[PDB]
């Protein structure tokens, strides 16, 4: 908004940007009438009372300075004319604010452009994320960036006495970079403002914007870019600002992908195990990449999305065991982004591994819908000197991507400590579209007791007989405490995901307590499975054999077959189980991103 003050002493000269509101102070220097050239529209809510509001609007840009005029006449005495020469310009900075009112808003009916972190590597043969320099080295790189467009409509000579400057706050320049195209940098970590070399008349200049940081504890994730129109007419004074406009970009969050999303690519380490996963992949329709152990624990493949582009992004875990380089060389690349968090030289724990990191399927909870589901990750029930957690920097980061609003589950009771070890999700053809698989000691005691009741108490696990497993009073106590622990999470998941019992399938699974009374799988942990659509790669439990078949496998089939799930039991025993993890821990999946556009959520 602007208030021009006019005077009989002499004429006023002023610019009006189309779309702003220009009022007029007629009273300050001195009844009155107003007449203006045809291009000016004087609405006028005359007596010389200062409560009278007089606005001026223009419809077309001027073709020449002082193009349009307003004449205010003051009247017992003869008239006194105060003159005002106006020049109208179009000054509009444009973005994709309708995601295909200078505030960013969530929702299908909100407004605000979207910006991707340029955290992938389109560059020829380098090893750096594209955004860690001040150059656009490849044409393909521009697809990842967001287009912003300055449009001006001015007289041929306007920029004789005006300059436009594009700028970002100092607090946000470390998070964004802006290239101008005919590509060179105009804004970035080094430069917060830049004078545009614009010609008079009708012009358009394209800018390409990338982000350099994902939202975090210290970054809500909004970047503001402003254009300012400056009067540089009087050579003995500074620039005076005449008009300021600006777009607000929101930095796209890193988004995770539940087991219910159609798989696209599988990952593992390098013999018979390797072959069975390679059969599942080929059935699941996805391509396969291999590495020459715990491919689950070191990385998590998410994605970032915007109306113009969407690409997968690896979340490299701060645990830095043998697979440490795999995310930065093999996965990162063209349309494959990269993020990491946490201390990299050491200072982590086992809950920092990404088998401790999962997402739920889309869910609705006492009204609040979570279209991308909710990150699940494990920790203790309270902090003590013995208790473990995922590092605060990872928790903080997942929360700052506000979209899959994380839930803390209880995993510290397990030796290894991964939510993976007691839970999985699977597709289902009805009811919310999935099932929760929770590991269940109750279920396996039931199954074994029924087996001994039907006469098979001499049947051998692995070698232990059913009769002995059930009579073992310590095994039972251990598995009761483990039931308490899993049950605590059952109810967490129930509350935080809005699940009912009919959303949940118990899978027979027995546990044992070992070092520091932490829990480990008594036989191969079936819930630690690889979900490749409806083709499931479950660990071979090597269960009691009744009627020419493992009664364990049989029970799971009874449970998952009627959901249209096809169970394959992979042998991972000497290769994986005895080393504290299973099929799910020896693998990873790239899955299809949600169709639902994260920015349409109202978190």
Residues near Ca ion (CB under 5 A) are 118, 120, 122, 130, 133, 141, 144, 316-317, 320, 335, 354, 357
Least distance in Å: CB of 537 to Ca ion?
15
Distance of alpha carbon 177 from alpha carbon 168, whole angstroms: 10
Distance of alpha carbon 602 from alpha carbon 596, whole angstroms: 12
| Token representation of residue 556 | 């799971």
Least distance in Å: CB of 279 to its own copies?
36
Cβ atoms of residues 450 and 545 within 8 Å = no
Question: Which of 143-151, 253-261, 489-497, 551-559 is the region at the interface with its own copies (rule: CB under 8 A)?
Answer: 489-497
Question: Length of the chain in residues, anyone?
Answer: 603
Stretch 135-174 residues interacting with its own copies (CB under 8 A): 165, 167-171
Q: Could you say which of 78, 109, 382, 574 contacts its own copies (CB under 8 A)?
A: 382
Question: Which of 132-140, 278-286, 471-479, 525-533 is the region at the interface with its own copies (rule: CB under 8 A)?
Answer: 471-479
Residues 98-137, one symbol each (x = binds its own copies by CB under 8 A, - = not), give ----------------------------------------
Contact partner at residue 5 from Ca ion, its own copies, none, CB < 5 to 8 Å by partner kind = its own copies
Cβ atoms of residues 373 and 444 within 8 Å = no
Radius of gyration of the chain (CA): 33
Least distance in Å: CB of 342 to its own copies?
14
Cβ atoms of residues 583 and 534 within 8 Å = no
Question: Which of 123-131, 178-186, 198-206, 472-480 is the region at the interface with its own copies (rule: CB under 8 A)?
Answer: 472-480
Q: Which of 592, 118, 175 is nearest to 308 (CA)?
A: 118
Stretch 517-576 residues interacting with its own copies (CB under 8 A): 517
Q: How does DSSP assign 28-68, residue by residue?
A: S---EEEEE-TTEEEEE-----TT--EEEEESS--SSTT-E
Q: Could you say which of 175, 490, 584, 590 contacts its own copies (CB under 8 A)?
A: 490
Contact partner at residue 120 from Ca ion, its own copies, none, CB < 5 to 8 Å by partner kind = Ca ion
Q: Which residue has the tokens 């042998």?
A: 571
| Token representation of residue 430 | 């009805």
Least distance in Å: CB of 169 to its own copies?
7
Rule CB under 8 A: say whether 579 interacts with its own copies. no
Query: What are φ and ψ of residue 499, in 5° steps?
Result: -80, 145
How many C-beta atoms surround the C-beta of residue 520 within 10 A? 16
Residue 276 vs 389, nearer CB to its own copies: 389
Distance of alpha carbon 175 from alpha carbon 251, whole angstroms: 9
Residue 190 vs 549, nearer CB to its own copies: 190
Q: Which of 91, 99, 405 is nearest to 250 (CA)?
A: 99
Bridge partners, residue 588, by sequence: 267
Residue 379 vs 553, nearer CB to its own copies: 379
Residues 385-424, one symbol each (x = binds its own copies by CB under 8 A, - = not), give ----x--x--xx-------------x--x-----------
Contact partner at residue 477 from Ca ion, its own copies, none, CB < 5 to 8 Å by partner kind = its own copies
CA distances from 282 to 268, 482, 589 (A): 14, 37, 13
Least distance in Å: CB of 571 to Ca ion?
22
Distance of alpha carbon 24 from alpha carbon 19, whole angstroms: 16
Bridge partners, residue 212, by sequence: none
Cβ atoms of residues 183 and 118 within 8 Å = no
Distance of alpha carbon 65 from alpha carbon 58, whole angstroms: 14
Q: Which of 422, 398, 406 is nearest to 584 (CA)?
A: 422
What is the pairing mode between strands 434-440 and 504-508? parallel
Hey, CA dihedral for 314, 320, 321, 324, is it positive or negative? positive
Rule CB under 8 A: say whether 451 interacts with its own copies. no
Residue 331 carries which DSSP code? I
Question: Which of 84-92, 102-110, 336-344, 481-489 is the region at the interface with its own copies (rule: CB under 8 A)?
Answer: 481-489
Distance of alpha carbon 204 from alpha carbon 92, whole angstroms: 10
Rule CB under 8 A: say whether 602 interacts with its own copies. no
Residue 271 vs 501, nearer CB to its own copies: 501
Residue 25 vs 335, nearer CB to Ca ion: 335
Rule CB under 8 A: say whether 381 interacts with its own copies. yes
Rule CB under 8 A: say whether 197 interacts with its own copies. no
Least distance in Å: CB of 344 to Ca ion?
7
Core vs surface per residue 68-84: b (16+ CB within 10 A) or e: bebbbebeeeeeeebbb
Contact partner at residue 167 from Ca ion, its own copies, none, CB < 5 to 8 Å by partner kind = its own copies
Residue 56 vs 426, nearer CB to Ca ion: 426
Rule CB under 8 A: say whether 49 interacts with its own copies. no
Residue 272 vs 501, nearer CB to its own copies: 501
**Residues contributing to the site for its own copies (CB under 8 A):** 1-3, 5, 28-29, 50-51, 165, 167-171, 192-193, 217-218, 226, 228, 234, 236-238, 240-241, 244, 381-384, 389, 392, 395-396, 410, 413, 442, 446, 474, 477-478, 481, 484-485, 487-488, 490-491, 494-495, 501-502, 513, 517
């Amino acid at each position: 908004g602007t208030l021009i003050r006019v005077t009989p002493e002499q004429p006023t000269h002023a610019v009006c940007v189309l779309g702003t509101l220009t009022q007029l102070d007629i009273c300050s220097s001195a009844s009155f009438s107003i007449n203006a050239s045809p291009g000016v529209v004087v609405d006028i809510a005359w007596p010389l009372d200062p409560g009278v509001e007089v606005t001026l609007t223009m419809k077309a840009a001027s073709g020449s300075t002082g193009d349009q005029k307003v004449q205010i006449s003051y009247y017992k005495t003869p008239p006194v004319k105060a003159l005002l020469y106006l020049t109208a310009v179009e000054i509009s900075l444009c973005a994709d604010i309708t995601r295909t009112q200078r505030t960013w808003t969530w929702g299908p009916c909100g407004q605000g452009a979207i910006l991707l972190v340029n955290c992938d590597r389109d560059n020829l043969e380098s090893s750096a994320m594209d955004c860690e320099d001040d150059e656009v080295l490849d044409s393909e790189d521009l697809q990842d960036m967001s287009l912003m467009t300055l449009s001006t409509k001015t007289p041929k000579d306007f920029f004789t006495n005006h300059t436009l400057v594009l700028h970002v706050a100092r607090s946000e320049m470390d998070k964004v970079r802006v290239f101008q195209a005919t590509c060179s940098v105009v804004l970035g970590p080094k430069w917060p403002s830049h004078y545009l070399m614009v010609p008079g008349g009708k012009h358009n200049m394209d800018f390409y914007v990338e982000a350099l940081a994902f939202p975090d504890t210290d970054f809500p994730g909004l970047i503001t870019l402003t254009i300012s129109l400056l009067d540089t007419s009087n050579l003995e004074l500074p620039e005076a600002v005449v008009f300021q406009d600006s777009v607000v970009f929101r930095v796209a969050p890193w988004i995770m992908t539940p087991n219910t999303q159609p798989p696209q690519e599988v990952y593992a380490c390098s013999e018979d195990f390797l072959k069975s996963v390679t059969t599942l992949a080929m059935k699941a329709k996805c391509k396969l990449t291999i590495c020459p152990q715990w491919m689950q624990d070191e990385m998590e493949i998410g994605y970032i999305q915007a109306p113009h582009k969407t690409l997968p992004v690896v979340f490299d875990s701060p645990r830095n065991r043998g697979l440490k380089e795999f995310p930065i060389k093999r996965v990162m690349g063209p349309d494959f982004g990269y993020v990491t968090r946490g201390p990299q030289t050491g200072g982590i724990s086992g809950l920092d591994s990404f088998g401790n990191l999962e997402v739920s399927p889309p869910v609705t909870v006492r009204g609040k819908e979570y279209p991308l589901g909710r990150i699940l990750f494990g920790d203790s029930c309270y902090p003590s000197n013995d208790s473990r957690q995922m590092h605060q920097a990872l928790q903080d980061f997942l929360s700052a991507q506000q979209v899959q609003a994380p839930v803390k589950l209880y995993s510290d009771w397990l030796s290894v400590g991964h939510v993976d070890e007691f839970l999985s999700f699977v597709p289902a053809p009805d009811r919310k579209g999935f099932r929760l698989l929770l590991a269940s000691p109750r279920s396996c005691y039931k199954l074994f007791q029924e087996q001994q009741n039907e006469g098979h108490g001499e049947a051998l696990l692995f070698q232990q007989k059913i009769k002995n497993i059930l009579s073992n009073k310590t095994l039972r106590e251990h598995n009761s405490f483990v039931e308490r622990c899993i049950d605590w999470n059952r109810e967490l998941l129930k509350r935080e995901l809005g699940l009912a019992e009919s959303d949940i399938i118990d899978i027979p699974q027995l546990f044992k307590l070992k070092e520091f009374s932490k829990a480990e799988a008594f036989f191969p942990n079936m819930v630690n499975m690889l979900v490749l659509g409806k083709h499931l790669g479950i660990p071979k439990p090597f269960g009691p054999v009744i009627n020419g078949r493992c009664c364990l496998e049989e029970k799971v089939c009874s449970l998952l077959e009627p959901l249209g799930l096809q169970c394959t039991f992979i042998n991972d025993f000497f290769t994986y189980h005895i080393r504290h993890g299973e099929v799910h821990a020896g693998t990873n999946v790239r899955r299809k991103p949600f169709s639902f556009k994260w920015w349409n959520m109202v978190p």
